[PDB]
Structure 1
Amino acid sequence: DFQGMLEYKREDEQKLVKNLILELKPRGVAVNLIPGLPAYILFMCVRHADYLNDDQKVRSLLTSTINSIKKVLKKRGDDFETVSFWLSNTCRFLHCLKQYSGEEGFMKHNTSRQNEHCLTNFDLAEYRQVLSDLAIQIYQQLVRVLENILQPMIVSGMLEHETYTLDSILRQLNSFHSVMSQHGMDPELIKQVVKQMFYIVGAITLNNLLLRKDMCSWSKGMQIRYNVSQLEEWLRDKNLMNSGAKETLEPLIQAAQLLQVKKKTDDDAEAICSMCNALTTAQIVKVLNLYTPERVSVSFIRTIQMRLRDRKDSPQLLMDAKHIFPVTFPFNPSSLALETIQIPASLGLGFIARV
C-alpha cells in the first residue's frame, strides 16, 4: 500500500522537470492512455515535499514547473498539440492543487481516501493565482495558433466556392476537437474553445462579404446559409448546442437572410428592420448597396436608414476578428486515486520513488 506521493533527490529536480515537462511529448503511449498524467505526477511530488515540510524544495519545484512550462510554450508555441496539451495539464495541476488544498470548499467531491491526501504544512494559495494566470496566458496562445490555421481557409470554404472547401473547415474542426479531447482538456474549456472558433469563422466571413461586391447576391445567400447549417450540424453531433457557439453566427446568418428577402416595398423595408436585430445599420446598408440580381433602389436604402434611427449604437461595419471572449477555468475535481498511480517507464523517471 502507498500513500500517493513521489519522492526525488533534490539534485535530480532539473532532470525531473526536463523529462516531465521540457522534453515530454504531447503525443505518447502513457499520456494518451492516461490524460493529465504529468499533472498528477507533478502534484504527487509536491505532496511529499509538503510532507517533508521542506519549503525550499516546495518552492523549487513549483517555480521550475511554471518556468519549464513557459520554456516549452516559448520554444514550440506555434504548435497546436503542444499548446493544447499544456493548457490541459496546467489546468489539471491547478485542479489538483485545489482539490487537495485542505480547503473545505474544494473538497465537496472527494472520497474519504482522497481527503487523506490533502496538503498539511503549506498554503499554496498564492501559487494557484500565478498558475491560473499562466493558464489564461496559455489559452490565448491556443486561440492564436487556432486562428492562424483556420484563417486561410475561411473565405475559400465559406464563400469563394460553388483553395480549401467547407468540408476542409469541418475537417479542421474535427481535428481540433479530438486533440483537445485526447488531452483530457476540461469539457467546459473545450466549449469555450469551440465558441471562439465559430466566432472567428463568422467574423472573418462577414467582414469579407462586407468588403466585396462580388459576394452579395441571392445565390450566395443560399450558399452561406447552407454552410452555416453544416456548422450547426457539427455542434449538434458533438452536443455543443449550449456552448454558445451557434449564437456567435447570428450576424452572419442574418446577413445571409437579408440577401434573400424581397427588397422593394415599404413592407419589405419594415421586415428587414425587425429581422436584422443582430446586424448594425452600417452593415445592413452595406449589404443592400452591394446586392447583385432589380437593384436595391437608393430610396429603399434611405427608407431603411430613416426607420432605423431608433438605434443609438455608433455605426460600425467590421467585426473584430481578433476578439477573444474572456476564458474561465471552473474547478473540475478528478475521481482518480493518487494511491494507485504508477510511473510508466517511458517517462524516463526511474529516479523517483513512490511513497
Structure 2
Amino acid sequence: NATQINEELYRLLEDTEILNQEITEGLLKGFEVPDAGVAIQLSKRDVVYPARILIIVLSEMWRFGLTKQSESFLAQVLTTIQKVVTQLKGNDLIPSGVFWLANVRELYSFVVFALNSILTEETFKNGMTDEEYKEYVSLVTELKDDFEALSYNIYNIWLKKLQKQLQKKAINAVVISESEYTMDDILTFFNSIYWCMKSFHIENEVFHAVVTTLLNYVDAICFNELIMKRNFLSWKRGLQLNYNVTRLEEWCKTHGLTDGTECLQHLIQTAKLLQVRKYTIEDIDILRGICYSLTPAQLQKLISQYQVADYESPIPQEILRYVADIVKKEAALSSSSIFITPETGPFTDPFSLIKTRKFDQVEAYIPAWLSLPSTKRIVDLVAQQVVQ
C-alpha cells in the first residue's frame, strides 16, 4: 500500500497548476481571520494554520525532489501574501495584518530550521550528489532571504497603514477633543492592536515595537498641529491636553508598557508649558529645564502663541526679548525647523530581533470549513504514511 500512497502524492505535487490555484484562492485569498478578541480562545493551530499547511506541502515537495515545483509554488505564495497585506483596508487592517505577520514568521521559522538542518546534519550531504547539495543549500538560502524580506515588507506596509488610520483620528482627538473623534476612539484603536497580538500568540516584543512606533507618531503629528495653532494655546487648553495624554499614559501602564511616557514627551512638555508660570525671567529658566525635549525656537514659537485669558496678565516684553535672546545664541552654535519629522518609515522588522520559533514537529491538521480538495488529500496521505 505504501507504494500506491507515495505514487498518489507525487501526482498531486507535480501538478502545481491545481495546487497553486487552491492555495492562492482558497487559502491565501480565501483566508478567514478568526475573531480577534479573547472572548473565544485561539490555540496556535488556529492562528498559523495556513503556514502549517504550506510547510507540509513544501516538505513533501522537497522530499520527492520536486525542486522545480516547490520553487514556483513559494514564489507565488510570497507574491500573494504581500498582495493581500497591501490590499488591506478598513476594519480588517489590524486583525488580518497581524494574522499574516504570525504566519510569515511561522514560515520563516521553518526555512531557518531547514537551512540549519541541511548544513549541520551530514545525512543530507552524504545522501545526495555534490551538485544536488549545492542546489538545495542555495535553494533554501534564497528562500530564507525572500521570507525575511517578506516579513520586513508586509510589516512596513501594515505599519504605514496603521499610521494613516491614526492621523485621521489622532489629531482631532488629542488637540481638539475635550472631556469628530474622541480619546475613547484612540484608546479603542490601541485596544484593538493589543487584543489582536495577544489572541494571535504574537511575541510581546512586536507589540512593544508597534505601539512605540505609533506613539512617537501621535506625539509628532499632534505637536506639529499645536505649534501652528493660533488663538488656541490657553491654560485651560493645556490642562485639557494633559488629561488626554494622561489617558494614553494610563493605557500604556495597564497594558505592559513602561516607555509610553518617553514616547509622548513633546506633548507632555507642551501641556506643562501651557500651565506653568511664565511671568518673570526666573520662570523661563525653570521652563527650559522641564521642557528638555523642546528647542529654543520651539519654546519661542509656543510661548508667543499663548492664549492669555480675560483675567490673566500678558507676558512682559522683557520676557519675550529674553527668550529671543536665547534663540540668538543657539543658532550661532550650529555654524533648523520648529516641527518634528515623524518617522514614516522604513521601519526595522521587530520579528528580526527575536529568535526564530524553535520548530517542532507539526500535527497534520486542516480546518473543516476550508475547501481545498488536493491540499487536504496530501495532508491526509502523509498522516497515514507517518503511522506506517
> TM-score per shorter chain, which class?
0.7 to 0.9
| 1:348 matched residue in structure 2 | 371
Deviation of 1:174 after TM superposition, in Å, equals: 0.6
Q: How does 1:1-355 map to 2 (within 5 A)?
A: 8-11=12-15, 12-14=18-20, 15-27=22-34, 32-33=42-43, 34-76=46-88, 79-80=92-93, 81-102=95-116, 122-123=136-137, 124-162=140-178, 163-241=180-258, 244-293=259-308, 294-307=313-326, 309-310=329-330, 312=333, 315-321=336-342, 323-324=344-345, 326-328=347-349, 329=351, 330-334=353-357, 337-349=360-372, 350-354=376-380, 355=382
Deviation of 1:212 after TM superposition, in Å, equals: 0.8
Deviation of 1:254 after TM superposition, in Å, equals: 0.9
Deviation of 1:10 after TM superposition, in Å, equals: 2.9
Deviates more, 1:312-321 or 1:278-287: 312-321
Question: C-alpha distance in 1, partners of 2:222/2:146?
Answer: 37
Q: Which amino acid aligns with 2:85?
A: L
Q: Which amino acid aligns with 1:353?
A: V
Q: Which amino acid aligns with 1:307?
A: I
| 1:111 matched residue in structure 2 | none
Let me know the Cα RMSD of the aligned residues: 3.0
Question: C-alpha distance in 2, partners of 1:206/1:160?
Answer: 12
With over 3 angstroms needed to count, the CA separation of the structure-2 counterparts of 1:143 and 1:228, relative to structure 1, is: same
**Per-residue CA shift, 1:243-278, capped at 9, x if unaligned?**
x44322111111111111211222112112222220
With over 3 angstroms needed to count, the CA separation of the structure-2 counterparts of 1:302 and 1:325, relative to structure 1, is: farther
Q: Structure 2 length as normaliser, TM-score? A: 0.77
Deviation of 1:186 after TM superposition, in Å, equals: 3.1
Q: Give the total of aligned pairs.
A: 335
Q: Any idea what SS the aligned residue of 2:336 has? A: coil
| 2:127 matched residue in structure 1 | none
**Per-residue CA shift, 1:183-213, capped at 9, x if unaligned?**
3333222211111221222112111111112
Higher radius of gyration, 1 or 2? 2
With over 3 angstroms needed to count, the CA separation of the structure-2 counterparts of 1:325 and 1:295, relative to structure 1, is: farther
Deviation of 1:287 after TM superposition, in Å, equals: 0.8
Q: Is the 8 A contact 1:88 1:185 kept in 2?
A: yes
**Gaps spanning 5+ residues in structure 1: where?**
1-6, 108-119
Question: C-alpha distance in 2, partners of 1:280/1:314?
Answer: 17
Identify the structure with the greater helix proportion: 2
**Gaps spanning 5+ residues in structure 2: where?**
1-8, 122-132, 383-388
- Identical amino acids, percent of aligned pairs: 24
Deviation of 1:320 after TM superposition, in Å, equals: 2.4
Q: Structure 1 length as normaliser, TM-score? A: 0.84
Q: Which amino acid aligns with 2:108?
A: L
| 1:114 matched residue in structure 2 | none
Q: Any idea what SS the aligned residue of 1:315 has? A: coil
Q: Is the 8 A contact 1:22 1:71 kept in 2?
A: no
| 2:124 matched residue in structure 1 | none
Q: Is the 8 A contact 1:195 1:248 kept in 2?
A: yes
